[PDB]
């Protein structure tokens, strides 16, 4: 059987399928170490499994598109959390109290007329 989750961040979407046994992770047809060259990204992706002691008991099949590095890592974490909730349905309290069940609704603000950026004004002189 499969357990499914969808995750999102800045501009990225991630599809996560989880199955039981012999922990191994495939992402867009590559390995974790092949895909991410950043320790921070690796730690982010690995967090929830470390939090709930099931690191070496589940296989993960993942696809992700849109955005950059950090956005994709966050999307993946969100999706894993959703899939785990679907699988078990009793880790919800721990996951929430940790902080992985919320969607992070932080986007890029727009440019406005008369300014150089969202909030930056030109230089002002009195005389």
């Amino acid at each position: 059987n499969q357990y499914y989750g969808t995750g999102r961040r800045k501009s990225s979407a991630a599809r996560v399928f989880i199955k039981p046994g012999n922990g191994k992770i495939v992402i867009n047809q590559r390995s974790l170490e092949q895909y991410f060259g950043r320790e921070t990204a690796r730690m982010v992706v690995r967090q929830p499994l470390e939090l709930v002691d099931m690191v070496e008991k589940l296989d993960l099949y993942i696809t992700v598109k849109g955005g950059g590095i950090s956005g994709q890592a966050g999307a993946i974490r969100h999706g894993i959390t959703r899939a785990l909730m679907e699988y078990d349905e009793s880790l919800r309290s721990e996951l929430r109290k940790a902080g992985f069940v919320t969607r992070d609704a932080r986007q890029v603000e727009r440019k406005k007329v008369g300014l150089r950026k969202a909030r930056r004004r030109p230089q002002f002189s009195k005389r």
Partner: protein, 151 residues
Amino acid sequence: PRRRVIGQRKILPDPKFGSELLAKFVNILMVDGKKSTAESIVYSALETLAQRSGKSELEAFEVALENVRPTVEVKSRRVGGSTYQVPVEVRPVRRNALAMRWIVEAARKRGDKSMALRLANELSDAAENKGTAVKKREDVHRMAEANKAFA
């Protein structure tokens, strides 16, 4: 502000070790949104510093900081048309912030070849109680002591 209360932002711990203090240090060192470069510099410095003293990186860092943490400082007051220096106490968060800021400012002014080398040299000298960081601490403490009458 005037009528506001501001909460505390969460900070992720470092990946190699698990300290938020080191994360704050990396943040204070970064420039122009380049976190990877700052992480490289910090890790290289701690690696080159662990050998010199035969102790863990966290312990070396703590020892270096404890000689630059300040306790009292001086604020400026002017209500009678004249400027007075008034001594006030510092709280632990501000202690840590000032210590890290002074360390990095002192490092940037040195004359070695690489930023990692300069940082390692400054940290070792601070552990040995020498350098511009300790000089700044001493100067601030002198200025605080000279104005005890205005407390």
